[PDB]
Swiss-Prot record:
This is Lamin-B2. Lamins are intermediate filament proteins that assemble into a filamentous meshwork, and which constitute the major components of the nuclear lamina, a fibrous layer on the nucleoplasmic side of the inner nuclear membrane. Lamins provide a framework for the nuclear envelope, bridging the nuclear envelope and chromatin, thereby playing an important role in nuclear assembly, chromatin organization, nuclear membrane and telomere dynamics. Belongs to the intermediate filament family. Residues 1-111 form the LTD domain. The chain holds residues 469 to 589 of 620 of the full protein. There is a cross-link at residue 21 (Glycyl lysine isopeptide (Lys-Gly) (interchain with G-Cter in SUMO2)). It is linked to Partial acquired lipodystrophy: A rare childhood disease characterized by loss of subcutaneous fat from the face and trunk. Fat deposition on the pelvic girdle and lower limbs is normal or excessive. Most frequently, onset between 5 and 15 years of age. Most affected subjects are females and some show no other abnormality, but many develop glomerulonephritis, diabetes mellitus, hyperlipidemia, and complement deficiency. Intellectual disability in some cases. APLD is a sporadic disorder of unknown etiology. It is found in: Nucleus lamina. The modification Phosphoserine is found at residue 29. It comes from Homo sapiens. It comes from the Eukaryota. Dimer. Lamin dimers then assemble into dimeric head-to-tail polymers. Ultimately, two head-to-tail polymers assemble laterally into a protofilament with a uniformly shaped rod of 3.5 nm in diameter. Interacts with TMEM43. B-type lamins undergo a series of modifications, such as farnesylation and phosphorylation. Increased phosphorylation of the lamins occurs before envelope disintegration and probably plays a role in regulating lamin associations. Phosphorylation plays a key role in lamin organization, subcellular localization and nuclear envelope disintegration.
């Protein structure tokens, strides 16, 4: 199984998006992978990817929310259409799971303002 081929790159403070990065030397076949963003406030969800999509060696993919008001710009910026919050919270465990169904990565990100120099927007 692809144990940590893709990893957590960046995550939003409120969980409006996930940013992933493939540290592997080959094209990671994506689809059976899923991002479990579980918030202690009660909302816990797993974004299962599309098995049509393959993420490249040394490339990265940003999965935003539909309710983030963001423009869906494939294949750099995928947007979970039909999800507004994408697991909003002041503290949440954003888990990356592979095709096997094993939790290959995870980062507990909190609303402490994670995005620096966001002063222009």
């Amino acid at each position: 199984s692809a144990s940590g081929s893709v990893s957590i790159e960046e995550i939003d403070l409120e969980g409006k998006f996930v940013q992933l990065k493939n540290n592997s030397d080959k094209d990671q076949s994506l689809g059976n992978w899923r991002i479990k963003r579980q918030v202690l406030e009660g909302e816990e969800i797993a974004y299962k990817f599309t098995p049509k999509y393959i993420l490249r060696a040394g490339q990265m993919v940003t999965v935003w929310a539909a309710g983030a008001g963001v423009a869906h710009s494939p294949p750099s910026t995928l947007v979970w259409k039909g999800q507004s919050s994408w697991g909003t919270g002041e503290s949440f465990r954003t888990v990356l799971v592979n095709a096997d169904g094993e939790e290959v990565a995870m980062r507990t990100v909190k609303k402490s303002s994670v995005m620096r120099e966001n002063e222009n927007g």
